[PDB]
Enzyme design. Sequence first.
Site, PDB file in Angstrom:
ATOM      1  N   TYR A   1      54.375 -51.665  33.418  1.00  0.00           N
ATOM      2  CA  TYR A   1      54.563 -52.422  32.184  1.00  0.00           C
ATOM      3  C   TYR A   1      56.036 -52.454  31.797  1.00  0.00           C
ATOM      4  O   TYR A   1      56.376 -52.464  30.608  1.00  0.00           O
ATOM      5  CB  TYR A   1      53.710 -51.860  31.040  1.00  0.00           C
ATOM      6  CG  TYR A   1      53.799 -50.354  30.840  1.00  0.00           C
ATOM      7  CD1 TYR A   1      53.139 -49.479  31.702  1.00  0.00           C
ATOM      8  CD2 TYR A   1      54.517 -49.809  29.778  1.00  0.00           C
ATOM      9  CE1 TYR A   1      53.209 -48.102  31.527  1.00  0.00           C
ATOM     10  CE2 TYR A   1      54.591 -48.431  29.595  1.00  0.00           C
ATOM     11  CZ  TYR A   1      53.933 -47.586  30.475  1.00  0.00           C
ATOM     12  OH  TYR A   1      53.999 -46.220  30.308  1.00  0.00           O
ATOM     13  N   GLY A   2      56.915 -52.481  32.793  1.00  0.00           N
ATOM     14  CA  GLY A   2      58.345 -52.476  32.546  1.00  0.00           C
ATOM     15  C   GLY A   2      59.079 -53.262  33.606  1.00  0.00           C
ATOM     16  O   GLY A   2      58.599 -53.421  34.733  1.00  0.00           O
ATOM     17  N   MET A   3      60.246 -53.776  33.232  1.00  0.00           N
ATOM     18  CA  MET A   3      61.155 -54.422  34.166  1.00  0.00           C
ATOM     19  C   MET A   3      62.569 -54.003  33.805  1.00  0.00           C
ATOM     20  O   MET A   3      62.895 -53.881  32.622  1.00  0.00           O
ATOM     21  CB  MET A   3      61.038 -55.950  34.128  1.00  0.00           C
ATOM     22  CG  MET A   3      62.050 -56.650  35.023  1.00  0.00           C
ATOM     23  SD  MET A   3      61.940 -58.457  35.052  1.00  0.00           S
ATOM     24  CE  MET A   3      60.388 -58.691  35.916  1.00  0.00           C
ATOM     25  N   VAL A   4      63.407 -53.802  34.819  1.00  0.00           N
ATOM     26  CA  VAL A   4      64.754 -53.276  34.636  1.00  0.00           C
ATOM     27  C   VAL A   4      65.757 -54.291  35.168  1.00  0.00           C
ATOM     28  O   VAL A   4      65.632 -54.759  36.306  1.00  0.00           O
ATOM     29  CB  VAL A   4      64.939 -51.918  35.341  1.00  0.00           C
ATOM     30  CG1 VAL A   4      66.350 -51.402  35.101  1.00  0.00           C
ATOM     31  CG2 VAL A   4      63.905 -50.906  34.854  1.00  0.00           C
TER      32      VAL A   4
ATOM     33  N   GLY B   1      64.747 -53.876  39.156  1.00  0.00           N
ATOM     34  CA  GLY B   1      63.519 -53.246  39.609  1.00  0.00           C
ATOM     35  C   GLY B   1      62.432 -53.397  38.573  1.00  0.00           C
ATOM     36  O   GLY B   1      62.634 -53.989  37.510  1.00  0.00           O
TER      37      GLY B   1
ATOM     38  N   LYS C   1      65.805 -51.660  30.294  1.00  0.00           N
ATOM     39  CA  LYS C   1      64.405 -51.672  30.685  1.00  0.00           C
ATOM     40  C   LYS C   1      63.595 -52.292  29.558  1.00  0.00           C
ATOM     41  O   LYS C   1      63.551 -51.752  28.448  1.00  0.00           O
ATOM     42  CB  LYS C   1      63.903 -50.265  31.013  1.00  0.00           C
ATOM     43  CG  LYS C   1      62.393 -50.170  31.145  1.00  0.00           C
ATOM     44  CD  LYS C   1      61.950 -49.162  32.205  1.00  0.00           C
ATOM     45  CE  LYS C   1      62.205 -47.727  31.792  1.00  0.00           C
ATOM     46  NZ  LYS C   1      61.559 -46.770  32.745  1.00  0.00           N
TER      47      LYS C   1
ATOM     48  N   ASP D   1      55.805 -37.604  37.915  1.00  0.00           N
ATOM     49  CA  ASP D   1      55.851 -38.736  38.844  1.00  0.00           C
ATOM     50  C   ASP D   1      57.142 -38.721  39.652  1.00  0.00           C
ATOM     51  O   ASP D   1      57.770 -39.763  39.876  1.00  0.00           O
ATOM     52  CB  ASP D   1      55.699 -40.071  38.116  1.00  0.00           C
ATOM     53  CG  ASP D   1      55.329 -41.221  39.063  1.00  0.00           C
ATOM     54  OD1 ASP D   1      54.716 -40.972  40.131  1.00  0.00           O
ATOM     55  OD2 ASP D   1      55.679 -42.377  38.749  1.00  0.00           O
TER      56      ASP D   1
ATOM     57  N   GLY E   1      58.284 -51.858  37.076  1.00  0.00           N
ATOM     58  CA  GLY E   1      57.198 -50.898  36.971  1.00  0.00           C
ATOM     59  C   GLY E   1      55.919 -51.541  36.460  1.00  0.00           C
ATOM     60  O   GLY E   1      55.830 -52.772  36.403  1.00  0.00           O
TER      61      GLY E   1
HETATM   62  N1  LIG Z   1      69.604 -46.947  35.082  1.00  0.00           N
HETATM   63  C1  LIG Z   1      69.192 -47.527  36.220  1.00  0.00           C
HETATM   64  N2  LIG Z   1      70.093 -47.920  37.112  1.00  0.00           N
HETATM   65  C2  LIG Z   1      69.689 -48.485  38.248  1.00  0.00           C
HETATM   66  N3  LIG Z   1      68.453 -48.742  38.640  1.00  0.00           N
HETATM   67  C3  LIG Z   1      67.558 -48.353  37.745  1.00  0.00           C
HETATM   68  C4  LIG Z   1      67.831 -47.736  36.519  1.00  0.00           C
HETATM   69  C5  LIG Z   1      66.574 -47.506  35.908  1.00  0.00           C
HETATM   70  I1  LIG Z   1      66.174 -46.652  34.060  1.00  0.00           I
HETATM   71  C6  LIG Z   1      65.612 -47.962  36.746  1.00  0.00           C
HETATM   72  N4  LIG Z   1      66.213 -48.475  37.873  1.00  0.00           N
HETATM   73  C7  LIG Z   1      65.522 -49.084  39.028  1.00  0.00           C
HETATM   74  O1  LIG Z   1      64.368 -49.753  38.564  1.00  0.00           O
HETATM   75  C8  LIG Z   1      63.172 -49.142  39.118  1.00  0.00           C
HETATM   76  C9  LIG Z   1      62.081 -49.118  38.077  1.00  0.00           C
HETATM   77  O2  LIG Z   1      62.333 -48.159  37.056  1.00  0.00           O
HETATM   78  C10 LIG Z   1      63.637 -47.784  39.640  1.00  0.00           C
HETATM   79  O3  LIG Z   1      62.825 -47.299  40.698  1.00  0.00           O
HETATM   80  C11 LIG Z   1      65.079 -48.047  40.060  1.00  0.00           C
HETATM   81  O4  LIG Z   1      65.136 -48.652  41.345  1.00  0.00           O
END
Ligand SMILES: Nc1ncnc2c1c(I)cn2[C@@H]1O[C@H](CO)[C@@H](O)[C@H]1O
EC number: 2.7.11.24
Length: 349
Positions: A27-30, A23, A45, A140, A25
């Site tokens: 300024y972020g990518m996970v 997923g 992240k 949020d 955001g």
């Molecule tokens: N620990 C995790 N395990 C699984 N998915 C995760 C996380 C985390 I930190 C974030 N996300 C997924 O990535 C999106 C952006 O934060 C989030 O909306 C969510 O979909």
Amino acid sequence: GPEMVRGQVFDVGPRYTNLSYIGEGAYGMVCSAYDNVNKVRVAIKKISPFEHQTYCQRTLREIKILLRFRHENIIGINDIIRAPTIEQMKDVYIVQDLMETDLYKLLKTQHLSNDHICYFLYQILRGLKYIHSANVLHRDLKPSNLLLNTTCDLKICDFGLARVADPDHDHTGFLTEYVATRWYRAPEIMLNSKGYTKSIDIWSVGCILAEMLSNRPIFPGKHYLDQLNHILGILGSPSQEDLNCIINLKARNYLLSLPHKNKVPWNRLFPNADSKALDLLDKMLTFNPHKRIEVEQALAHPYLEQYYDPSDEPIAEAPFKFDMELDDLPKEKLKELIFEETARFQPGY
Ligand SMILES: Nc1ncnc2c1c(I)cn2[C@@H]1O[C@H](CO)[C@@H](O)[C@H]1O
Ligand SMILES: [Cl-]
């Protein structure tokens, strides 16, 4: 070379390998990743804030808050990867427990049973009770910031907008900018509030409950001000008492310019819902933030009676406190603080 996910390089080796997108955001990518040390797949992240002061503030606040917090219903930080020197550090990787999905993805696939709605709501509020007991606001809350697994464990994540509550400085003018997600903004955001009080989070939880009951966002505003019109489309025109709590003349004159709107009964929107759920929803989605239900009161509501148990609901030891005021510091100052906050995770130390 380092691995790359959707055009983004995650320089997290050699410990974390076999990366896969999850997923994203602002300024972020996970991604998910395999930890060769702990022999488990984790979430990582990547945050790249250092070119903007506001992104550095939020990165510092989220790191400091989540490193301090420890609670079953809140995502924790297992590890932080960054560069050995402050000059090579352009990215911060935050390593977290991997969860399977989030509530936004889940609601696109499935209609929840009342039992699952009740238990998810309980866990949201149990986590929120801890956060608010530390005098912290999330600011949020929304379905995509609620992480889930197949056993229905829930964790609140994405504290980028989190702050210490500051009611004395909550007041602001009409139509001021706001960053939190539009559909989950309380009506006062558009009228007179900076979102610096606990009532801001309760509203968002009410919006989330509505979405669990129906798989529809309850207030899907198309634009900033349209959001308020949708809220009034359900709550109706505010009473004179509630009108009198809005002192801002531009905000008050805007409300008085609107045609009268009727209150729409909750059971029209949610004809199959538990009536106790709708009574709690009513108290969470109150126009006046001073009359809106508080987190412990929500947990104590009859809808949650099978779960509420203060002896199994941890609170924080004391209110959270930031040493210095982050809003002033330049991004170079903030970058040093972030370097220091992450030192404990670096090899050596
Ligand atoms: N620990 C995790 N395990 C699984 N998915 C995760 C996380 C985390 I930190 C974030 N996300 C997924 O990535 C999106 C952006 O934060 C989030 O909306 C969510 O979909
Ligand atoms: Cl607008």
